[PDB]
Amino acid sequence: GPVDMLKNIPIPSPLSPVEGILIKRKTLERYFSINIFEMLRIDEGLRLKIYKNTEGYYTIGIGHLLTAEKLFNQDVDAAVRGILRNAKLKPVYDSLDAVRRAALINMVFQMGETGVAGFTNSLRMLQQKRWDEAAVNLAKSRWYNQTPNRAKRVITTFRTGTWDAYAA
């Protein structure tokens, strides 16, 4: 979605906007703000020519296993319409803020909507905004053990709600 491809500035809120509408650049620089496209290039690379994966099966661009931006906005769009169809995932998705909905879309990129739906206890803790407890629990998984640098970044994204695991 055009809406959910937007750059997002995780300011804690309530904001102190100057006269209700202006927020000075000097104040925003106090942040790391990116969009999901940039989030996933870090995690999944951008390759403009075919290569063939860690697994491997051959892939291209950002994590598009076949058998770039426009093809990435396809997949993201196909990720959420997935989540929104799934019956465990939609409630949590509907429930989250936007930086955290990107972390969830990220997990679905890595491991599929069925795989993610299988995180039932972490998912409960994210719908209740129990962020520490969710992070402790995700860190228990195989996902974590198997791709720890990337899982740490995505867990940091849930615990904090900021893009700061990607300042690197």
Place this chain on the structure above:
Amino acid sequence: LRWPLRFVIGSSDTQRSLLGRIGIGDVLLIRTSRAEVYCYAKKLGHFNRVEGGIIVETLDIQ
């Protein structure tokens, strides 16, 4: 002949002084989210952001 249509998505009734402390890199809150088609200062109808473009619902011209 031709009519300039603005497809407006929000408005922020600011005031006087802020302009122009407003500068590059700053952010303007949209304090009223809308989705509307104007011709000059005249409200025509509601559109909405779809597909890979826009669809304009009612389009009242008189």
Place this chain on the structure above:
Amino acid sequence: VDVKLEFVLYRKNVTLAELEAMGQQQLLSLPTNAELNVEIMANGVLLGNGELVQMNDTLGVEIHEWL
């Protein structure tokens, strides 16, 4: 005192044909680019433009060009 900033996603010079031709729900083609060049106008005057950004309660335009 009050002055209405308008956030204009898109502008297009249109005549009656296309005008009726869209009062019938025709897709007006935008780029995917669209939201990165949101226009800010006050009195039918173009002050600047910019990029739609979110701060999940509210939308914002981060200014690229101003006056």
